[PDB]
Structure 1
Amino acid sequence: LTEEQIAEFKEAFSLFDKDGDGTITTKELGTVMRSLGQNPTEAELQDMINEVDADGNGTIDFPEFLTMMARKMKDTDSEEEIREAFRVFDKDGNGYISAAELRHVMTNLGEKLTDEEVDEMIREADIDGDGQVNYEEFVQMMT
């Protein structure tokens, strides 16, 4: 597991850990999933942590989160999580994530970013140079 990959997972960990105490509770899992239009039950949230929870204190610290990401979670029906996630970013559904939509998703996830920073994020994912991120560029970015 590479340096950049542990830094990306550390970044994903920080967005679920809303109070910043180093553990992700079922409550933070629920609150982040509901803010992205999902509605998990208490039993589904408890199984999600029980799968990852190696030391048994009921929460997920960053070592456990790291183990989860390495031996990745399996698909039941949703094999293309890339398209599902792409639809969360592409708010108006036209097939292209603009800087405005990306800025909107970062604010919903709880972070204030400069317009230059959002513009640099678009520039990282943009392969053809049109100033936006389509689906094929979103996939390449993750694969």
Structure 2
Amino acid sequence: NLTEEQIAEFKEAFALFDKDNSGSISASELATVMRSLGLSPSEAEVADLMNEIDVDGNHAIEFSEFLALMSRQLKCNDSEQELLEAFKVFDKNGDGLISAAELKHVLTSIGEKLTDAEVDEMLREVSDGSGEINIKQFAALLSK
């Protein structure tokens, strides 16, 4: 599934968690990196992650388990690029937001004649009080 280069690249990332170069990621290494990035995992969350990811049962994430953790991201790279391209179809001015005027232009392109009021309402249903739709909301919308 993975090339020699893909393995190498993940190994470098893995090595950044592994502060003492022991060949695995401890609960303290995991908690430290996550906290330094502002993710504030609780102890119960860290304990759960070690249990779920290190199926070897040593409370130390090995490289093979790190790869299995990240493999879905590789499987999903094409979908992520498509999502961004689809968002760009709406977002003509490229400011990372979809407005009602941009939604209207797509609607017209595909032969859907809606009043401006209906376009406003269409956008409002999925915007969160906002006048525009951002990439997060675009993705959330497609999560059913």
What interval of TM-score do these two structures reach, taking the shorter chain for normalisation? 0.3 to 0.5
Bigger-Rg structure (1/2) = 2
Q: Please report the TM-score for the alignment, with normalisation by the length of structure 1.
A: 0.47
Q: Which has the higher contact order (CA 8 A, sep 6+)?
A: 1
| Bigger fraction of residues in strand | 2
